[PDB]
Design an enzyme around this catalytic site. Sequence first.
Site, PDB file in Angstrom:
ATOM      1  N   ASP A 302      64.318  19.735   6.289  1.00 11.83           N
ATOM      2  CA  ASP A 302      63.426  20.461   7.180  1.00 11.83           C
ATOM      3  C   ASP A 302      64.056  21.278   8.294  1.00 11.83           C
ATOM      4  O   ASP A 302      63.691  22.441   8.497  1.00 11.83           O
ATOM      5  CB  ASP A 302      62.381  19.509   7.761  1.00 11.83           C
ATOM      6  CG  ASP A 302      61.514  18.869   6.686  1.00 11.83           C
ATOM      7  OD1 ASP A 302      60.814  19.589   5.941  1.00 11.83           O
ATOM      8  OD2 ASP A 302      61.540  17.628   6.580  1.00 11.83           O
ATOM      9  N   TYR A 388      53.633  17.046   6.557  1.00 16.34           N
ATOM     10  CA  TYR A 388      53.933  16.075   7.613  1.00 16.34           C
ATOM     11  C   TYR A 388      54.224  16.609   8.981  1.00 16.34           C
ATOM     12  O   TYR A 388      54.667  17.742   9.147  1.00 16.34           O
ATOM     13  CB  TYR A 388      55.083  15.074   7.377  1.00 16.34           C
TER      14      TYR A 388
END
Lengths: 655, 655
Positions: A302, A388
Amino acid sequence: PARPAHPLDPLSTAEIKAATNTVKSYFAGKKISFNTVTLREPARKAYIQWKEQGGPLPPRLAYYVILEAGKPGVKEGLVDLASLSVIETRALETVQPILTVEDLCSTEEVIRNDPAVIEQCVLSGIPANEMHKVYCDPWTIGYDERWGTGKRLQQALVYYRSDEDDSQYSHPLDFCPIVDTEEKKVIFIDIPNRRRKVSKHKHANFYPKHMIEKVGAMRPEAPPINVTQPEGVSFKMTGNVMEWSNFKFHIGFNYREGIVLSDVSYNDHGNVRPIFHRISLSEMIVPAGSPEFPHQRKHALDIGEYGAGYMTNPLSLGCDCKGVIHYLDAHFSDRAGDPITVKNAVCIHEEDDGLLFKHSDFRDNFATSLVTRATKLVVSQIFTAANYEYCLYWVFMQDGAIRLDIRLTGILNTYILGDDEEAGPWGTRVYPNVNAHNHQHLFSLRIDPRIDGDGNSAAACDAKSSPYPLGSPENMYGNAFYSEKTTFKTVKDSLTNYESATGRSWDIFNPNKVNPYSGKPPSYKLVSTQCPPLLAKEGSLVAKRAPWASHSVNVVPYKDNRLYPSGDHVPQWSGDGVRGMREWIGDGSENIDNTDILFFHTFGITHFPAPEDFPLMPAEPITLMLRPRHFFTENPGLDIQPSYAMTTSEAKRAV
Amino acid sequence: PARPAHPLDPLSTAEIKAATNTVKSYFAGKKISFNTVTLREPARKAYIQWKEQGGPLPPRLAYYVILEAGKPGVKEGLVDLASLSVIETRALETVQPILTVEDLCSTEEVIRNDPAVIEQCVLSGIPANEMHKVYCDPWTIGYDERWGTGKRLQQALVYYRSDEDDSQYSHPLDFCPIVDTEEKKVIFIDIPNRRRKVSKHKHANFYPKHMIEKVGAMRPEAPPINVTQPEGVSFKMTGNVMEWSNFKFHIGFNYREGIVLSDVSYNDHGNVRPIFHRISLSEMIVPAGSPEFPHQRKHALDIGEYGAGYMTNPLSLGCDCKGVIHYLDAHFSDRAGDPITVKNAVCIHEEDDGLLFKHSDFRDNFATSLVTRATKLVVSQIFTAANYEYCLYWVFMQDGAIRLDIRLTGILNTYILGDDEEAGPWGTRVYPNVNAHNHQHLFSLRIDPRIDGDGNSAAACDAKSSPYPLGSPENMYGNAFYSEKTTFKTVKDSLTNYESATGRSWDIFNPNKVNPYSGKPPSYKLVSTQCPPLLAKEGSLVAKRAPWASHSVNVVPYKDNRLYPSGDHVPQWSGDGVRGMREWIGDGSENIDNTDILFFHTFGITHFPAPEDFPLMPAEPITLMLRPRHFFTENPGLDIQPSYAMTTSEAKRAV
Ligand SMILES: [Cu+2]
Ligand SMILES: [Cu+2]
């Protein structure tokens, strides 16, 4: 452009524009787009000289990364803002850059309009005239041996909403489109042998209106808990510089790492002592555990593939931060070279944190007593990575410790599950036809220490029984135990893992100084326990692309610009080659004892989904701490006014 | 005496008196003193029958422990309060009971007036006419092979205050007096070969007046942070019964374990589901690490040798608990048989606990978003064990999890250090002439589970890579991993330790039920990571007296009154014999699969003192959690009003 107050301040909207204008000129007549325009922080040595040796203000530089239509890979360089000129440039044709929100947002519309994708939706049970109900989270392809870095690619995790307000995650489709980002066309669709059509169940939703329909009604609003600071806050900010409870540090921020804490020191009663030069999250990797195709491609890094800055949520509205908040904004460049702003990207505030310390004397039934409450300073941000959310909290404490708290929330990465299909051992059936795969969340904390000054070292600390046996003169009753300190001399020595068997911790210390009482060097101890072993095997995609994740600790020599452990351009890198942490480690023979070092800590959790995590999951906490040990000569918070304090004499005197 | 509201309520002051009157009569003409008068909780089966099968109210019983002058050991029994009569009694002549504050407080004056001790003080540099400046913390002798349980003994850790308001811990003396508790005389003094006279340095103090003299002055009072609940609290108490956010449980308390949480259930939208029948701390052991004589005798089992109830601090004054607090009082008996009360022994309140969960859609730049704040319910107590304080926090959360937080604070156990003496590897020189020995703090969490009903099991859960190799059809990219569940069939199987290598956790589940979505049984998972291995060696005093501390987990069959793992009467037990956990384990062959079980978890920390810990130490945190996994079919907190919530359609609609 106007120089900033501090050399470490992020580029201003003006600097960003100045930088892109400069780049556009250099590439006049070329069709270029902007991927990244960010501060190139000054050399460590120069910064320190400027800060404490009256040295010159460092040149204000901007690092940029651009794409040129019809050209493979990217072009990157440095712009000297003072002279508005490119002072360094180069082309990297076999690399792919971080994916910006712009890069991501366009993908959905292109799959919706692709004939092949449409056919697949129809095959899956979705009328071709309802493609507007089809959605997808555009991920990096991560890495796929079929294309390498030859084309900039995204993989679309396809979902379906029966209503735009649904949470699509209860309805994934079975196929996966591969999209050419800079061509805006689907070049291939991974289709499974076992077909699964859209779940015919209702979406698993979570907004109040949905809940009222699902369970009876919402719970009654709860009696409020109000937090107020009538007389203001105790911390003071001077631009991005923070001063609080003797701590002084600079709060920086960038597209990739998000919050960056620099030049951290503690005012030890007049003696201003450095602690860290820079600390932040430098990379992540969330490896999924299903070995089935094409799920190997799910192991998002990420930070390097999306950016904790680019993905950050504006914190004001949500009531994400409670109390008297102070905010900071973030500025980046868009594809066009224009500054974009995300309001209230970072939130700062202080709050009660329980007891700092307490002690009562049983002699007068605890009449003699002293109690001091603890208050903490919190610098926070929250970013969204498709499904998320990661809630990051940097916490400074009144005992001199610094803690990093992370809370995982958001939604499970879900894939489709056949009616009679077993979520097998690789995932959990959290809702009819929904398979939430196992996965780990691993982070790479990058610490550039300056413990009480220059010349630092690191060591593993293991608790151990005396080697002498029970009944020996040396350990008659067998209760003897000590702490074994193994200080790392060479890079190779630092590659260590957390070990529950010895309750291992690591020290970052200054071998050039000594605590006048204990005789030990001053240090900050890393007390971190949520250190999952990397489950993906050696030689796996995951292990190759995230060389830093294999060990809990990695200590390498400092070098300017050694920030990102998986390389500067992460997407689509195969993991082969000497770069990032693999490059810094080298043959593992370089010295890391009493010198300028970089300490990269790998921590996180291993997630085996359960229904409680669906359709929206409750926060899961992760934390690590850096405690001063032998740094001070006594508890540093004793000069804080106690919340209550009765002396023995006063207790007597009180009738 | 009047029957209490609830069968699990602690004895009332009236019941205590009724009980002692009854005992006094039974032993008419005997010189007896009261050591313990406490509730004998009703049989598990009877309680449940009464609670859910309309069964009869259980008999109200009092367990007592008395001493009789001139008689060895103790006498214990049960008093039936309804008929004011002794219904069970027996003598234990080779055992020694818990030490009460009364038992402790008398010791100091007896050493001050002992000729031998005085001579030793003079030898140590203290004028015989200044014995009033000599102090001592009276500990159990723990265990000393020279006397066994033949005499009730205490060992005095001697200190010196130059002024009554000093913190004596910076000035320990080198010798240790052994005192006959029930004879009030010093019977022996352990004297080292190497003599060390009183430190001539000034006391290391910590009250404001001391600090002003030590450093410049105190810090300015900080701007207040006020927490208010204008509309009251959301929790409701009916006597000792608590109801909050669907949780319902009974808050009990006793002299030994302190807080005892019982009959814990969660109201799953009308379906009231049991979770635990009883949960609490059942024992502790703080083993020191110096092998030198007589330091083997330092390994206090605080709960069993002093009592987390008897040692508890009255919480009101100190401002220990912030916000809108609700308190509970504790009642015990004194030596005379009269009820004694400690006001505000337990404090209850709710507070903000950050985010419960959040999620935003990147599609409209996070305009679509839902955020719900978390609030926690905290039942707390704080007890003092001579030099250290233990802050206990039982925390209930809105995601259905229950957490136990502990904060260690107070003062280091210190011994004298010669001017040129090396604190060696067994301790740290935290102040001139002061040696703070290494030691561990281990706790034994006792869980009597009733997970979603009766018939439970336990299992270890280890994360593991697929056994298939990289490149195999089964694990082509080597990223496959699962959770290996080893469910305990026999007691022997449960004796397990935390393992960082597999990120081990343990499940307490109900094999008789199944989650309709995941297909797994409902469970509560123990996520505990601060699990130190017992450093004292096998066969050591420490290991023998605390058989439960050798493993992180111990699961045994349920039996009424299996509470204390180191035996009912801990002081001076040699560790030899089949009792406590050693007895429950037996030959390790009994069944613990799908039956009534008891789960004892050993956790805590290993402490290597540093100057920062002196002269008063900053709180050190320890925590463990019990999370519902496969217990619910979806996130149980979704019906809680969000703090903010914008739907995608509403976002559009908002211009
Ligand atoms: Cu996860
Ligand atoms: Cu300790």
